[PDB]
């Protein structure tokens, strides 16, 4: 029982902004992707994420307070382990899931099996690497991107056996004139 | 009462409130119910209304069959009925229809000290912003509205509510 | 054993409350509760419990007119029969006026995960404080509130259903209870 | 002849406010019920009572200033007294007129009788006992409610033997946009 | 009308109390209390009330472990019917481990007898405090005691008697409830 | 309702005592006489009444701290009423009940009747009037002693219409060996 | 506790408790139940003892039937047996019947330290003095006792209870 | 391998005490009750159990200094795990072991099993909450009491499962003339 922050490995490389209201921060956490029915292979993109831009709609500019990956095994798991990988990188990288290990930061996990626990593992994401802004009046590349990636397990089945929830605070400001 | 400098941000919006002319309208618009406003209000749990107003606006359909629409605030509480909008002090009553002048774009304000601005906080108030529109059974209906009420304004939303996604 | 207090992810957001005349004030007594939540392990089970509703706190809340929580914990239990039977469990301290289903925990701020028994370890109480910063603390006034304190918990029908509970979740606490009311007797 | 005040044990107990301009205070004394004609037992709601409102209507806020309960019996009280009972609860209190003697400040008067006066008897409503407005942005339970009972009188006749009026003042703020 | 506040006779002689530990002190509060001692009118009615067994204020003192009365007072109503068919009372606020049958109220010390009805302003009612220096004020506590106050009253089989009482008397007050007891919820 | 003290006049004429441990007070209150069922003529003397002496009975000293007369009209009172005559004197007074009104301080007393209400008249004994001693290492006569007297009743009946009680605290001292 | 200086007195007292030679005899006499004590704290509210022995007189009759009497002192609570007296450290045992001397009157202190000297309180105490005394079967009864157990000694006083008289 | 405190939720509300010599204090240690045979629900109460009062015996007054409950599973868990239920309430309390976690403070734990360890569970008797006099001149009602429970075991043996002990220490006071 019980939750752990693992940090990812990161270098100096923050995202480049604009010169520069009231804000409001509002905190979220949607799933990014699931795992144990098929080999599976996210490419989760925090500015275009649906999820997240349903809070953005409304503004101009929407800035990542915090922010942090959330990997959470299900009984499952136990009996059935996996291993998933795990590197937060700007969505500019070339670098894709199934090679996250070739990646300075890129972390690998094994989730289940009689050995060990049933934690909830944290991998939050480094701000200064990437860049904050993920709506802004220009579209940077430098936006976080979360990259994830798991073997088609062993025992497939419509049951997840591991998911991971990216969770975190915006900065909304300058708001947009939409309808309704 | 008001409120603070805690985290708190004003959105504008604005949307559709009665429409005219298919048949006899007497509408009783609650924002604080008005679906627009809520999916605003939703991430939040703290709403507060900073401006407000009712605009009337007709179609050209209004030509050839001009109507006569009445348009009221009151609070929630207010026993007043459509029908009844004139008696009312807020009450107003045009005409529409290319017959009727009002300066450009008819729209009647809330005014605040009427009512509550609430909408959304720890308790239900019961005295927030109500339109009351009347306009009589029309002469010749259509499906197709004659004239319409939109309502635009600002809300000031503040202490983010837990929510899916 | 052991006991794990897991906190939950929490935002500060207060519930406003009326205020009370500078008359005389009422005395005050504060009761300690603790009653079960839900049960799994027989069939999936997602239920939302409101603490305005909860039959057991207001047995004690009855006759007062004015009652207000002071601490208040989600205590998972997981049973012997879930360490070869595992489960899975979400839990999230909802502010009741907020909309969410308990198969949406997960998609929820705070929302956690926990997984009882299989595991190593996993025999242990999990424990899940209520943020009364949350939310409401107010479960009795001249008014009731909306964003009163609300438990949300979720599962999913188990692979190997049985009669006897596998886990289960208390909500314990202690409540302020003052301005008794007039009654028969 | 005279008057004679005879206050209700109370407790504090006051109700809960909003937090929150010119105010008006309106005096007011409506009848509550009536006696003689057959058993009585009437549940006033200030809050509610048509007479109140008629001066409510017009506002918003309207809060109680003082209020009292005023019994008052009729010569034909001389001739078939009779027994009244009175307790001044919150809206909220499940008690019923039936069982005022079982609250808390319930009293009991004995009214006409060759043996007494034909004195009126005043039982003003403790304010820090209920909740004080009795119409405000929100509804409060807390209410102040007059409970009265009397059995059925030993000689019925449609001329009342006693009545009790509730005269007080109340505070009007906030003016309400009403229709005329 | 009017009300007429009677004392008893009395000599000092508080009932002994336990004592707390100085460890921290349980909250409390203090709720107020009425209900029906006796009805006179019907038949010759002879009670003794034990403020210890009283049901009506036990069903407040149930929750609680430690509960102490801080005042009381008998309150004696004549009713409309009196008036043409008087009753006399006796009444006498008595320490409970104590004999004297309610019978015997006018040679008990303290012992009073009032005369409802008849009589000039006999619709008036009565009220005998009961002197808390008299008896022992605990009703509930680590021990039960035997100086707890006990209400006596007593009258006689009437000339008329008639199925609605003539008279009655309530017992009102308000009591100290603290150290609340572990209960199943 | 309610009661009444009437003090009987009285004049200094103390009981002589002698010269003279610890003490205790106790009170006490048992009925002197009852009226109503026929002419009643009581001569309650402190000294001797047996409810008194009951408590004395363990001692060799017991001076009276206080004492006063207690009369009580009851129910039958208001519609038979009757005359009470009553006289605190000193044992040695040849004066008898049917010749109260003759002694100085001999007051008269009605009670019942439509006209009066039913209060409870008390006629405290002024301990400087007789001797306070109601046992001692010698038996004095100064001993104070109560008269009463009423006619024979209009209507006769074996339900008391009014009776007269006499409470009090003794001071009891120096104890006597008894058997038990 | 003890007792303060509050209007208080103390008062003597002796009364028979219990009797030898008719038959068997094991009693276990309670002060706080003897009623002649209690003829006396009647008037009061709280009771203590002072003074108290118990005291063993033989009847002529006792030298052609010479019998042998046990006595102990122990609080209420003690689970002693008037059969396991000599078991007891308080136990005597006297012959009585002209064979057994003992000084002017034979009697048995009690302590107080032993036991509790309330008899009567605001509550019901366990451990209040209590007197165990055994005789064995007699050879040849009488209906005339040959000896009895007097229980004399002194108890304070105060809080007078109200009382009918 | 090791032991672990498990603190149970307590409130304020201590045993009132008699106003108030040499003393000695005395450790101790029975066993409350054993589990693995069959369903058992236990309600030690330390006033009247056997092992405690054969301590208590020679004394008036005995009170607790500090006392805990002790959990100790055995070999026999591993195999075939098992739930228990621990509250210390006050023999007052109208709780049932069946019902023990609807107590403020009850506690469940589970022993057993391949997943955990096999620790001994200490849960300590917080003495404000209860009465701390085990016997005194008077019985008090407010004594601490254990409750404990668990289910009829899945696989019933004459061999035990976990048994659970009671040790502390007693201050004894004015000794108690017994026999022998």
Same mark, same amino acid.
């Given at each position: 029982?019980? +939750? ?11 995202? $480049?902004?604009?010169?520069? $209201? ?12 699931? #795992? ?39 009984? @499952?798991? +136990?009996?059935?382990?996996? =291993?998933?990988? @795990? ?14 290990? &070739? ?5 690998? #996990? +094994? ?20 860049? &904050? ?5 220009? =579209? ?5 991107? @979360? @990259?994830?990636?798991? &073997? ?16 975190? &605070? ?11």
């Amino acid at each position: 029982s019980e +939750v752990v922050k693992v940090k990812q490995a990161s270098i100096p490389a923050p995202g $480049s902004i604009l010169s520069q $209201s009231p804000a409001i921060v509002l905190p979220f956490q949607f799933e990014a992707t699931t #795992f144990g029915t098929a080999e599976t292979a996210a490419q989760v993109s925090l500015q275009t994420a649906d999820p997240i831009t349903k809070l953005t709609a409304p503004y101009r500019h929407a800035q990542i307070v915090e922010c942090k990956a959330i990997l959470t095994p299900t009984d @499952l798991a +136990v009996s059935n382990p996996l =291993t998933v990988y @795990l590197a937060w990188v700007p969505a500019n990288s070339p670098a894709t899931p199934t090679q996250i290990l &070739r990646v300075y930061g890129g972390q690998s #996990f +094994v989730l289940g099996g009689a050995i060990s626990a049933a934690k909830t593992i944290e991998v939050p994401l480094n701000l200064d690497s990437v860049n &904050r802004m993920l709506k802004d009046s220009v =579209t940077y590349t430098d936006t976080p991107k @979360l @990259l994830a990636y798991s &073997r088609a397990p062993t025992n497939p089945s419509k049951i997840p056996t591991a998911s991971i929830q990216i969770s975190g &605070r915006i900065r909304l400001s300058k708001p947009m004139l939409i309808a309704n």
